[PDB]
Symmetry: D2
Subunit: 264 residues, 4 copies
């Protein structure tokens, strides 16, 4: 009767289904997979990447950057929504092979430093190569790359360092306000009376209102299905996409229903 | 015309004036200096230290621990109010010479990891040996050592990771509620429109209310003069000490007056 | 045609076969598994652990410590042979649950900091929760715990920070010289012309001579079969154990034969 | 009788005397000060900096990079001889303001991570802002930037991670072999029987022979006076410069004389 073997982080096949660069705005592209969002922003002074997906997506992220004309030494900054392996996986490998710098808040930095281990709810089950944050950003701080400004909005809940990123792009000259907000879900979490997260409910409630007030003409999420995106249908990908109000209110209804069924 | 030399962190002499262990409660002692608070809590399973003072106070903190009968291997945990050199200085040396573990939040951990460098308001002017945090604590989390529970209360403002620690001790059997709250000052800070701290005012206002609601029969601060303590007069040290209400309201009046004179 | 799933570090069942504490000397015990060595040294001032095994062995290491009468707060120091997941796995969890400090050289520390990721030969295939080294030791440095001195001997090869630990114990008063040397194997490594390790051959040759000259009356290795130990037969576990000379010369013959078959 | 104040790292004025970019080869420039070497290598794919000097030289290093036409985002890599404050000072600030990556060995990385604190011989006396190493290099490893290859040669002694860097440049088409070797001095060190460095003598002796065998047509050192350079006289700066043989043999004579006077 020996000890159990180690279990590997296994996800659905659609999360690992590679796709071609899909354009979001004049300077914004989707270079992740069918069910995982990885946003690339091309500026006059380099590129910016937001999230990366599963750890084995590093080679795919570099190939689509080459398709857009972004050499590895042109990737300047890496921004993160939260430091889970399904979104910050290939960050450590991308830093070695691109020379880019990582910007994140203190909570995402300490979670990225230990590779997702010692998670508040998952423990050491979902881990990935660790990476060090190069610049610590605060709530409301602005990050400027090539004339494009990225504003961070802390929305703690899914992770303590969950962050929504906003910036103003253009769509054939006409301006567009992009809001890439993090997941508002609490999958299998203990909500009431969590010793590792005593203020989890208060953080979620304050995060629901934060998403509602984000300046947003076009919302994206780390998982496209959460905001009713569909990367597979190309030009119709953002047709049925939700607003910030509809995304936050739909997640809060699921939160209260999950919080009510935990009391039972 | 050469470049300027490096300037050393020089403080008042009363900050470095060593004193004997002054008793606060049955299990709580003051082992710092006349104008710097370093609290020792002796339990049945070891000791707990809260803050340390200037970096050159390491030898003094160990001598007073020996006076109380606490061997270096008996110091179990190190708690921090905030990670400035005048309070987290000898932490790196204390870890090497005691085998203790450091518990702090994510913001204090990342500031302790770079030794106070790259400060939001002071830059690299006030630095000290860096130390790594061993356990990350959240807001409201409980730390239990030898049957004594320490509850963390985040009060961001002076530093993003400023933390107030509360625990229930006894005074000859009779219970006492101790609240060791951090400094609420903003010395020379840019309050309105700080690019390194855009939500500084909102964090201070939410911290004022946090201190007022702390369960406290006896308040202590990293600087004794902030709460009208006087470690030099021995038995009369806590005579004119302020309450949590009086400490927060007095700091908020100084904050609003300083915030008003910044508009000019 | 999606991307491949993540593969889990799967080892033989005998590596995860728990066993009872087997005594080596008066103060030395084997508390690992049948095919993985985890040595515990009990002193008057606490305990010392050398290696831990697979990451899922943390609970087993704590149970055998309780069998020997070693509370979690009594584990003082953790020493490592090398920072691979099959020997430094549960180190991160053991630090959180015991308050112990980790001592290792600079090469083992940087490999332990990134959880075995970015390995010189294995890449990100074999990973484990990361841990931070608390004390950096040099070649020939002495570590003293409870009157028992541990001397480090750098033997680079298997990993750049591979370390052999030696100490003098007793066997019913009569002294015994224990040498816990690391693995000298190079499983699947590129030996000649490795860009990640240009001096790999010179490091192995200098490590062969280092093991031969270790003061040793009783040799142990991270894998018991490497030194012909057999933890399952209890009192006869060290019967057919090899000497330091026989262990180094046998590994060098396998190294030269492997180095010769790489030229082909 | 209070505790002593903190003392600042104060050096000679000539170390902080700024100078204009002095050309060494077609692609190599000296952009440090009169008595501190900071080498810039301009390639087709960016620039490479070797050492930086005192921590307050960050602004000077950026101004001379602008004089050579190197924007902050064009500095690709930072290489270090050793991690003392008089040569790795502004590294932390240069990383934030340039987006460059730092490459160093494991010993220099762990010393750079704690900002020179806990030095083997100096303790916490000479400290500087800490920085994290992005890429770990081994002995003999090659670093290629813009077609120019940098080979690392470990020469432990002054620091455990002391490193000599070599590369082949041109001088009007004609090739030149540059060797930037680290200091071989042991200022005020305990050489025989150092508990923090038991193999200090063996490391120095093996480092003397390493410098002698470096492929070098033109030698530079972190301090120009060590190799008889004189940055002030412009075109005659390398006139009386020493060879690798003359530099190593002169330092070994001073080492043996210092080692002999320690026995007394
Ligand atoms: C940790 O990764 C998530 N979960 C998992 O992958 C699996 C799990 O559910 O435990 C394992 C998670 O964060 O819960 C990720 N996250 C989201 C999300 O939208 O947040 C969705 C949808 C599920 O997959
Ligand atoms: C960084 O250390 C403080 N300031 C200084 O020591 C000096 C400064 O004022 O700049 C330097 C600070 O935090 O401002 C410390 N802190 C408090 C406090 O009560 O917070 C009081 C009182 C001043 O001394
Ligand atoms: C990384 O762990 C080792 N290998 C593996 O576990 C597997 C592999 O062989 O790749 C994976 C290794 O270090 O090669 C370990 N180490 C030793 C050793 O004795 O060094 C023996 C025996 C094999 O198992
Ligand atoms: C730590 O910086 C050095 N020393 C100092 O700056 C001062 C000291 O001597 O203690 C303090 C040192 O390393 O010894 C530096 N290094 C060298 C050298 O050439 O190595 C020379 C010459 C002296 O200045
Ligand atoms: Zn997630
Ligand atoms: Zn997710
Ligand atoms: Zn302060
Ligand atoms: Zn202060
Ligand atoms: Zn191994
Ligand atoms: Zn192994
Ligand atoms: Zn030096
Ligand atoms: Zn020097």
């Amino acid at each position: 009767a020996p000890l159990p073997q180690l279990r590997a982080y296994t996800v659905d096949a659609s999360w690992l289904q590679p796709m071609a660069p899909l354009q979001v705005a004049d300077h914004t592209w989707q270079i992740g997979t069918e069910d995982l969002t990885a946003l690339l922003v091309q500026t006059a002074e380099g590129a910016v990447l937001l999230d990366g997906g599963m750890p084995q997506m590093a080679g795919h992220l570099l190939d689509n950057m080459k398709l857009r004309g972004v050499a590895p030494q042109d990737l300047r900054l890496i921004l993160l929504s939260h430091a889970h392996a399904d979104h910050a996986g290939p960050v450590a490998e991308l830093k070695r092979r691109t020379g880019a710098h990582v910007a994140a808040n203190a909570e995402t930095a300490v979670l990225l430093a230990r590779g997702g281990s010692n998670d508040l709810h998952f423990g050491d089950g979902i881990t990935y190569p660790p990476a060090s944050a190069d610049r610590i950003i605060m709530d409301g701080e602005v990050v400027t790359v090539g004339g494009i400004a990225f504003t961070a909005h802390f929305m703690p809940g899914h992770t303590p360092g969950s962050t929504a990123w906003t910036w103003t792009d253009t769509r054939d000259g006409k301006p567009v306000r992009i809001a890439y907000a993090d997941s508002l879900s609490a999958p299998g979490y203990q909500l009431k009376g969590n010793p590792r997260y005593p203020r989890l409910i208060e953080d979620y409630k304050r995060s629901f209102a934060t998403v509602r007030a984000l300046p947003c003409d076009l919302l994206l999420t780390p998982h496209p299905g959460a905001s009713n995106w569909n990367y597979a249908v190309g030009s119709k990908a953002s047709a049925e996409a939700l607003t910030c109000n509809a995304y936050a209110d739909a997640a809060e209804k699921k939160f209260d229903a999950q919080l009510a069924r935990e009391t039972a």
